[PDB]
Enzyme design. Structure first.
Site, PDB file in Angstrom:
ATOM      1  NE  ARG A 106      -3.340  -0.046   2.810  1.00  0.00           N
ATOM      2  CZ  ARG A 106      -3.438  -0.505   4.249  1.00  0.00           C
ATOM      3  NH1 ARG A 106      -2.771   0.103   5.207  1.00  0.00           N
ATOM      4  NH2 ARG A 106      -4.160  -1.660   4.552  1.00  0.00           N
ATOM      5  CB  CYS A 130     -13.580  -9.552  10.340  1.00  0.00           C
ATOM      6  SG  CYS A 130     -12.396  -8.631  10.305  1.00  0.00           S
ATOM      7  NE  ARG A 158      -1.782   1.332   8.685  1.00  0.00           N
ATOM      8  CZ  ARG A 158      -0.886   1.095   9.602  1.00  0.00           C
ATOM      9  NH1 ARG A 158       0.056   2.092   9.728  1.00  0.00           N
ATOM     10  NH2 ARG A 158      -0.632  -0.208   9.733  1.00  0.00           N
ATOM     11  CB  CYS A 189      -8.650  -9.912   4.197  1.00  0.00           C
ATOM     12  SG  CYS A 189      -8.456  -9.408   5.871  1.00  0.00           S
ATOM     13  CE  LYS A 230      -5.124  -0.608  11.907  1.00  0.00           C
ATOM     14  NZ  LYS A 230      -5.180  -1.366  10.903  1.00  0.00           N
TER      15      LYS A 230
HETATM   16  C1  SRM Z   1      -7.964  -1.783   1.962  1.00  0.00           C
HETATM   17  C2  SRM Z   1      -8.830  -1.387   3.195  1.00  0.00           C
HETATM   18  C3  SRM Z   1     -10.315  -1.760   2.953  1.00  0.00           C
HETATM   19  C4  SRM Z   1     -10.898  -1.342   1.657  1.00  0.00           C
HETATM   20  O1  SRM Z   1     -11.563  -2.184   1.153  1.00  0.00           O
HETATM   21  O2  SRM Z   1     -10.774  -0.148   1.121  1.00  0.00           O
HETATM   22  C5  SRM Z   1      -8.455  -2.285   4.364  1.00  0.00           C
HETATM   23  C6  SRM Z   1      -7.862  -3.614   4.323  1.00  0.00           C
HETATM   24  C7  SRM Z   1      -7.494  -4.261   5.418  1.00  0.00           C
HETATM   25  N1  SRM Z   1      -7.047  -3.770   6.727  1.00  0.00           N
HETATM   26 FE1  SRM Z   1      -7.950  -1.840   7.622  1.00  0.00          FE
HETATM   27  N2  SRM Z   1      -8.386  -1.617   5.548  1.00  0.00           N
HETATM   28  C8  SRM Z   1      -8.925  -0.173   5.124  1.00  0.00           C
HETATM   29  C9  SRM Z   1      -9.511   0.585   5.806  1.00  0.00           C
HETATM   30  C10 SRM Z   1      -9.839   0.616   7.290  1.00  0.00           C
HETATM   31  C11 SRM Z   1     -10.759   1.237   8.147  1.00  0.00           C
HETATM   32  C12 SRM Z   1     -11.547   2.436   7.544  1.00  0.00           C
HETATM   33  C13 SRM Z   1     -10.873   3.891   7.341  1.00  0.00           C
HETATM   34  O3  SRM Z   1      -9.603   3.879   8.204  1.00  0.00           O
HETATM   35  O4  SRM Z   1     -11.421   4.818   6.983  1.00  0.00           O
HETATM   36  C14 SRM Z   1     -10.686   0.664   9.388  1.00  0.00           C
HETATM   37  C15 SRM Z   1     -11.798   1.027  10.342  1.00  0.00           C
HETATM   38  C16 SRM Z   1     -11.548   2.122  11.310  1.00  0.00           C
HETATM   39  C17 SRM Z   1     -10.849   2.078  12.538  1.00  0.00           C
HETATM   40  O5  SRM Z   1      -9.386   2.084  12.266  1.00  0.00           O
HETATM   41  O6  SRM Z   1     -11.115   2.085  13.581  1.00  0.00           O
HETATM   42  C18 SRM Z   1      -9.945  -0.439   9.348  1.00  0.00           C
HETATM   43  C19 SRM Z   1      -9.599  -1.041  10.357  1.00  0.00           C
HETATM   44  C20 SRM Z   1      -8.436  -2.117  10.534  1.00  0.00           C
HETATM   45  C21 SRM Z   1      -8.107  -3.062  11.788  1.00  0.00           C
HETATM   46  C22 SRM Z   1      -8.751  -2.891  12.975  1.00  0.00           C
HETATM   47  C23 SRM Z   1      -7.682  -1.820  13.576  1.00  0.00           C
HETATM   48  C24 SRM Z   1      -8.101  -1.591  15.188  1.00  0.00           C
HETATM   49  O7  SRM Z   1      -8.032  -0.343  15.696  1.00  0.00           O
HETATM   50  O8  SRM Z   1      -8.761  -2.408  15.652  1.00  0.00           O
HETATM   51  C25 SRM Z   1      -7.387  -3.879  11.142  1.00  0.00           C
HETATM   52  C26 SRM Z   1      -6.660  -5.069  12.023  1.00  0.00           C
HETATM   53  C27 SRM Z   1      -5.424  -4.527  12.836  1.00  0.00           C
HETATM   54  O9  SRM Z   1      -4.794  -3.550  12.390  1.00  0.00           O
HETATM   55  O10 SRM Z   1      -4.891  -5.347  13.729  1.00  0.00           O
HETATM   56  C28 SRM Z   1      -7.045  -3.697   9.720  1.00  0.00           C
HETATM   57  C29 SRM Z   1      -6.229  -4.535   8.719  1.00  0.00           C
HETATM   58  C30 SRM Z   1      -6.284  -4.680   7.329  1.00  0.00           C
HETATM   59  C31 SRM Z   1      -5.603  -5.534   6.550  1.00  0.00           C
HETATM   60  C32 SRM Z   1      -4.287  -4.828   6.168  1.00  0.00           C
HETATM   61  C33 SRM Z   1      -5.612  -7.067   7.225  1.00  0.00           C
HETATM   62  C34 SRM Z   1      -4.241  -7.646   7.925  1.00  0.00           C
HETATM   63  O11 SRM Z   1      -4.166  -6.787   8.736  1.00  0.00           O
HETATM   64  O12 SRM Z   1      -3.842  -8.295   7.511  1.00  0.00           O
HETATM   65  C35 SRM Z   1      -6.636  -5.585   5.487  1.00  0.00           C
HETATM   66  C36 SRM Z   1      -6.042  -6.001   4.172  1.00  0.00           C
HETATM   67  C37 SRM Z   1      -7.033  -6.617   3.111  1.00  0.00           C
HETATM   68  C38 SRM Z   1      -6.515  -7.084   1.703  1.00  0.00           C
HETATM   69  O13 SRM Z   1      -6.006  -8.110   1.502  1.00  0.00           O
HETATM   70  O14 SRM Z   1      -6.136  -6.070   1.003  1.00  0.00           O
HETATM   71  N3  SRM Z   1      -7.722  -2.655   9.370  1.00  0.00           N
HETATM   72  N4  SRM Z   1      -9.322  -0.214   8.133  1.00  0.00           N
HETATM   73  C39 SRM Z   1      -8.670  -0.063   3.589  1.00  0.00           C
HETATM   74  C40 SRM Z   1      -7.240   0.152   3.239  1.00  0.00           C
HETATM   75  C41 SRM Z   1      -7.205   1.685   3.892  1.00  0.00           C
HETATM   76  C42 SRM Z   1      -5.679   2.444   3.541  1.00  0.00           C
HETATM   77  O15 SRM Z   1      -5.005   2.582   2.562  1.00  0.00           O
HETATM   78  O16 SRM Z   1      -4.895   2.380   4.819  1.00  0.00           O
HETATM   79  S1  SF4 Z   2     -13.006  -5.698   7.832  1.00  0.00           S
HETATM   80 FE1  SF4 Z   2     -12.140  -7.663   8.367  1.00  0.00          FE
HETATM   81  S2  SF4 Z   2     -12.339  -8.729   6.242  1.00  0.00           S
HETATM   82 FE2  SF4 Z   2     -12.556  -6.668   5.776  1.00  0.00          FE
HETATM   83  S3  SF4 Z   2     -10.405  -6.022   4.864  1.00  0.00           S
HETATM   84 FE3  SF4 Z   2     -10.846  -5.486   7.166  1.00  0.00          FE
HETATM   85  S4  SF4 Z   2      -9.663  -7.009   8.403  1.00  0.00           S
HETATM   86 FE4  SF4 Z   2     -10.141  -8.078   6.304  1.00  0.00          FE
END
Ligand code: SRM
Ligand code: SF4
Ligand SMILES: [K+]
Length: 456
Positions: free
Chosen positions: A3, A365, A65, A326, A101
């Site tokens: 990314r 999830c 991020r 994922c 993060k």
């Molecule tokens: C690609 C994306 C979703 C999408 O369809 O667009 C995504 C995809 C992933 N996210 Fe994210 N997140 C994405 C936006 C977000 C958001 C929304 C936002 O930021 O606007 C959230 C929810 C808001 C928040 O953070 O509270 C989000 C909360 C998470 C979390 C939970 C973090 C936490 O505070 O508990 C994880 C898991 C972790 O970090 O442990 C995570 C983890 C992941 C991972 C990297 C899985 C992993 O840790 O191995 C996912 C990769 C999937 C793949 O195969 O591509 N992602 N993730 C977004 C990438 C954004 C970017 O460029 O950085």
């Molecule tokens: S919500 Fe769960 S299944 Fe969807 S991209 Fe984030 S970590 Fe993966």
């Protein structure tokens, strides 16, 4: 899993051509995936950094991020300044070890396209005479939860006050450092800023920030949001320029039979005079198109399938990546959305509301990447083919939806929505959104203070 760091989602055509080549020649999937944080991802990399460095790009120990910035403001002149700030904040925060993060945004009212309530730190732009004068600071949003763990919760951001433009970086630094110092040490599931705020109290946190920054916050300056969607199609920019926002389902860019989306964008990148803007809704903006160039751009976009019409419902729906890449996925999201919305489109038609929309989101999830915890109707993956159904958010994204039904399948979800959409269509007041309606009509109780009333 690569990314890129791309503040505000602005990418040049030179950089686009470089990433297009790499995606097609060096990855298993061959696609470019636009994310909801205004950047892109490659999937299945079989040199990535050398490629990035060659075109002036870098990929993010670092807990920060991508910094977001409203992509297509109604007052078009404001984007340049707001973008300069998003870029400065991004560079300022470049490597202190944060507990978890940290997510930041720069918002331009009345649009909340960047979904401010899902982020740790938000700078809401206040302008006077077409120029930014300062920012309202909101801190503490976050959407991740754990199924059945009532100690985790999605939380909206709290208003701290207003700050003049000159104090932006000092304030950004103070928020970051306070969180770094006060964040929970024992548990990581409780390290996020949203938990710290609830622990110490908003006023306590605010006081430390003022102390560290060396300023005193002024009272909040008026601001309102009217929506979160992109402005699909052509909009008039400043001067003789135009912006064409293309709806891309799931932000997945690849050549499909009869719809060469990837090649189409490459051809546009070769003739386009300006740059591109990746939106927080996983769409793309061909920005700064001179009026004289409009027909050439649209021709390519039209032929390639990038301008295929969809319903207002589909334009306002979103899903996270989930399977097949994922590793944390519980249920399909991206691959489930197209057909699911085909079903919702039919229900809307059945009830005479085909021109309306419901902010509907699917997250694979509870980590919540699809931002379902800020939707009017949110689906949260629980198991293969099973989701928790949440209702009651609003169109602007300032309220968390309470769980209505738990661990149900698509047919059960559709049956419940058929009934509710039917009621909304007949009993709603003028201009009343679906989420607000479910609350008013007593179908679901609202979430008024998440840390205490999210869970039944
Ligand atoms: C690609 C994306 C979703 C999408 O369809 O667009 C995504 C995809 C992933 N996210 Fe994210 N997140 C994405 C936006 C977000 C958001 C929304 C936002 O930021 O606007 C959230 C929810 C808001 C928040 O953070 O509270 C989000 C909360 C998470 C979390 C939970 C973090 C936490 O505070 O508990 C994880 C898991 C972790 O970090 O442990 C995570 C983890 C992941 C991972 C990297 C899985 C992993 O840790 O191995 C996912 C990769 C999937 C793949 O195969 O591509 N992602 N993730 C977004 C990438 C954004 C970017 O460029 O950085
Ligand atoms: S919500 Fe769960 S299944 Fe969807 S991209 Fe984030 S970590 Fe993966
Ligand atoms: K999209």
């Amino acid at each position: 899993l690569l990314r890129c760091r791309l503040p505000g989602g602005v990418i040049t055509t030179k950089q686009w051509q470089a990433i297009d080549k790499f995606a097609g020649e060096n990855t298993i999937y061959g696609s470019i995936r636009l994310t909801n944080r205004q950047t892109f991802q490659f999937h299945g990399i079989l040199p990535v950094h050398q490629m990035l460095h060659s075109v002036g790009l870098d990929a993010l120990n670092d807990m920060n991020r991508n910094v977001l910035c409203t992509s297509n403001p109604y007052e078009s002149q404001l984007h340049a300044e707001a973008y300069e700030w998003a870029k400065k904040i991004s560079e300022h925060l470049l490597p202190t070890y944060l507990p978890r993060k940290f997510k930041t945004t720069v918002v331009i009212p009345p649009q909340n396209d960047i979904d401010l309530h899902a982020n740790d730190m938000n700078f809401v732009a206040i302008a006077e005479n077409g120029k930014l004068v300062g920012f309202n600071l909101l801190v503490g949003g976050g959407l991740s939860i754990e199924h059945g763990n009532k100690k985790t919760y999605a939380r909206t951001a709290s208003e701290f006050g207003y700050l003049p433009l000159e104090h932006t970086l000092a304030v950004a630094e103070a928020v970051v450092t306070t969180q770094r110092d006060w964040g929970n040490r024992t548990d990581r599931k409780n390290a996020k800023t949203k938990y710290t705020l609830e622990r110490v109290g908003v006023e306590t946190f605010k006081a430390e920030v003022e102390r560290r920054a060396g300023i005193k916050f002024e009272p909040i300056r008026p601001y309102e949001f009217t929506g979160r969607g992109d402005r699909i199609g052509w909009v008039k920019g400043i001067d003789d320029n135009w912006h064409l926002t293309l709806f891309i389902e799931n932000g997945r860019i690849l050549d499909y039979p009869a719809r060469p989306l990837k090649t189409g964008l490459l051809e546009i990148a070769k003739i386009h005079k300006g740059d591109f803007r990746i939106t927080a809704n996983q769409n793309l903006i061909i920005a700064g198109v001179p009026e004289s160039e409009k027909a050439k751009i649209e021709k390519i976009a039209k032929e390639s399938g990038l301008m295929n019409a969809v319903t207002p419902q589909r334009e306002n729906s979103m899903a996270c990546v989930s399977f097949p890449t994922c590793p944390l996925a519980m249920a399909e999201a991206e691959r489930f959305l197209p057909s699911f919305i085909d079903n919702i489109d039919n229900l809307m038609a059945k009830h005479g509301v085909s021109d309306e929309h419901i902010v509907m989101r699917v997250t694979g999830c509870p980590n919540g990447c699809g931002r379902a915890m800020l939707a009017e109707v949110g689906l949260v993956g629980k198991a293969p083919g099973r989701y928790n159904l949440h209702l009651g958010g609003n169109r602007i994204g300032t309220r968390i939806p309470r769980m209505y039904k738990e661990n149900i399948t698509e047919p059960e979800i559709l049956a419940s929505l058929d009934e509710l959409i039917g009621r909304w269509a007949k009993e709603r007041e003028a201009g009343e959104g679906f989420g607000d309606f479910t609350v008013r009509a007593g179908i679901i109780r609202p979430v008024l203070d998440p840390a205490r009333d999210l869970w039944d």
